[PDB]
Structure formats: structure tokens, C-alpha cells
Amino acid sequence: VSTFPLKSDINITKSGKTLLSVGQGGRSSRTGFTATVFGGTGFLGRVVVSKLAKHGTNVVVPFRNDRARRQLKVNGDLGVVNFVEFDIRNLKSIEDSVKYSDIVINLIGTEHFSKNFSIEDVNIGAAERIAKAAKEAGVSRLIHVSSYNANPSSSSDFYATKGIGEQVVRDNFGPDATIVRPAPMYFRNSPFLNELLQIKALGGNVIFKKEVYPVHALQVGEAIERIAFDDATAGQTYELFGKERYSKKELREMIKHIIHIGQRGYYPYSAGFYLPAPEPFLYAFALIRQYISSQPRFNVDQLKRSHINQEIDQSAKTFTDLGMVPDELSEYLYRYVKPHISYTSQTQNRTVYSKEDIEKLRDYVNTP
């Protein structure tokens, strides 16, 4: 964020346009850039739209949910945030979103498949169509967000389609496409933290054994702001991850002590905080809810991913190439699990967990 995001007030795009910024960098200021944020109504999308629009950059937000786009307009001044009703199966709608854009950020991706879209259609088909449409519109910069374990030869549908998505985007848009591989992101209402905060987490012995390198979502959106406005980042791949490795079981137990579920010894077991189930049963339950439940549940592919840990591609670039220091989960863990605390309510004394308190709590969890 800061007070002025650009490193200079004059920027020349890859397509030759000269863009001049006006103002000190506030709501009424402008940067001269127009950006399209595909999937701007999602979790990461709202962070990206907020950062771009708060400094005056024009943001075009294609959308399919009419109620979800309303809160995005508050980020920018009048005329800054624009909306286009779009569908990845409508070519004309996508071409209208990128017609006036200098930067296109593709945040569209899914871990589930539904009655209308498969994993291939969103992770590969949508990315290819957006990338090819951006090039025909003469967009200077394209930013695609893949997954952390993107590998075209992976046995998981999510990781494989993300790996193919990286290659199909570079073929269509060209060598000037920047690819971002973010780790699981922690933030308010973060999907990575929502699963850990769920009291009745079925099959926690099979799912919560995955080890990851969680990264702050605010930094991921900040990194995208750096990448979009820096042409030196074109054609590169960025792996965004934290320094400290964590297992979901450690996070699950650390959260359990922060929420003070253990104030009553019987309660965590009675309330269902532990639901040990065989993996074949979890596979059957995940398979059934893939065709009965109308809401995306824990599906078959996510069961496979519980056995796959996050491996970091060493050749790719990191926060150091962008001049940033990754945030530590221990610093921000308390403020993002604070809403789920049982009672608190300043009864006697709030137990504020600092950076050192969280690290000590990690030792207690692993202490038998």
C-alpha cells in the first residue's frame, strides 16, 4: 500500500503507451493504469482489487455473482471500479473486459468440479481463453496465479491442471506472461484457516497431516501489485511462501489452545473436535457428496492432496526478487483466529498471543 505505489510518475507499457500518474497516491489520485482482475470477487480477488483501486488504478471486474461484486466498489473513487457481467463460456464478455486494460490478472481457479464446469475447464480452459483474448486486445502485461505444487505430471487433478495451465498460458499470451505460485494463504475468512477453525472436521487424522509453507494473503496481493507495475518481472515465475514450515496438525492443535476449547476437558472430544475415520470411508463420503450436496465439500481430489506435501521449486523466484520479507504466521496467527474465540468478552483478561507466545505454544503442542 504505502502512500504511492509506483516507483515513478511516468511508465511506458510493453505495448508502447505512456501512462502518467497524477496526485500523491490517494483515493482521488490516479496512476494512469487500467487493469482487469478476473475472479475479483473471490478471496484473493478482493485483496487485489482493494490494493489496485485504492491508489487510483482503474479496475475492470468481470463477475458472475451480482451480490458479491457490490463490496468491491467501495475500494475506489467514482469511476475507478468497473463491472462487466461475464462467463468463461461467453467469449464476447471476456473480450469486453480486456479491451481497455493494460494489465490482466487471472485469479480464476478451482479445486472442485461441478455440474457445469470440470477442473480442466476452469484451471486450463478458462486460463487459455483469457490469455489468448488478452494478447489479441494488445494487453501489455498478463499475470496468472497457479498453485504452489503446480506440476503437469502430478497425480492430483488440481496440481496437474495448474501445471498445464502455466504452459498453456505462456503459449497463448507469449513469453511476456508472469506466473505466480502462492502457498496456502492465511487471512480473515481464509479458506486455508477456515478448515482448521472448523470444530467438526471429519477425518482430521487423514487431512490435517499435510505440511505447507503458509504465506500472508496481504503480502500475496502486495506482491501482485509489485509485479503488475514492474515490467522487469515479465516472463518470470514467483513462488510465494513463508519461511517456517507448518503441518496442519500443529496448526489445528495450536488453534485449539487459542480458542480455549480446552477450558472444559470433556468438551473437545464430546463436541467432535476429533473425528478419526478410515480413509476408505472418507473416500466414499467424498465421492457421495460430489453428487448429492449442492455446496462444494471435501472432494476426492483434496483427499489425494492430503498425502502430498508442498515442495518448493528452487529455480523460481521469491519475495527477495521483489524486495520483500515474507511475513511470519506466528505474528499474524492471533489476529486471524481471534474472531473464533469462544467467550473472551473482556471478562477477566484477554490472552493476547504475540510472536513469541505463538512459537512457545508450538513447542507445547509437540511436547508429549
Partner: protein, 112 residues
């Protein structure tokens, strides 16, 4: 006089370390023969080198970030203006008003 009244005024520190005020007496307009506006001393601030004015692209409005751009203080004497500027700890400079030299003017001079 010596009291640093800016410590209690509540104004931001940028008024002292980044802005320059001008103490001046308004010059007589060349299009009018009135001199009423020249009888008072006024204080205004120099424009910001950047962000003083920029064009809003939606409607062509004159956007600005200078919060002192429309503030002009009025004083009855030069000494009062200096005393107030010193009291607030402002970086200022005085523009001395130009005085008109007196020359005798009579109708007889049209022929002599």
C-alpha cells in the same frame, strides 16, 4: 512571542517543516482604480510543487491534495501578521508592498 504555540495548536507538523507562508499586502489591480483591498495584510501558503492541482479524469474536476490551498488569513497591521506567524512557528517571508511615488498633477500642465 517566544512561546512555541504550535505544540498545542494541533496542526500537523508538515505546516512547519514543509510549507512556506507569504506575508504580503495585496497589490492594486491594473483593471480598477479602487484601493480598498490594499489596506490589509494577508497570509497565504506557497503551492505544493506536486499535487497542487491535477485533472480528475471522470469529470475534468480540479483535484488537489493541498489542504491550505484555500486559506487566506486577514490582518490589519504588518506587525500583527509577523507576530502570528512567529507564534505558530511558521517558515515565512515578507513581500514588501510597492509604494507609488507622488507626482504633482494639474490641468495647466496639459499646455505647460
Amino acid at each position: 512571542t517566544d512561546l512555541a504555540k504550535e505544540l498545542v495548536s494541533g496542526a500537523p507538523k508538515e505546516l512547519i517543516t514543509e510549507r512556506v507562508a507569504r506575508i504580503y499586502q495585496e497589490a492594486k489591480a491594473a483593471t480598477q482604480s479602487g484601493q480598498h483591498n490594499t489596506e490589509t495584510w494577508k497570509i497565504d501558503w506557497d503551492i505544493l510543487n506536486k499535487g497542487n492541482r491535477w485533472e480528475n479524469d471522470l469529470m475534468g474536476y480540479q483535484s488537489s491534495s493541498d489542504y491550505m490551498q484555500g486559506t487566506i488569513l486577514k490582518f490589519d497591521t504588518r506587525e500583527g501578521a509577523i507576530r502570528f506567524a512567529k507564534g505558530q512557528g511558521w517558515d515565512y517571508y515578507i513581500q514588501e508592498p510597492k509604494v507609488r511615488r507622488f507626482v504633482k498633477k494639474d490641468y495647466s500642465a496639459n499646455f505647460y
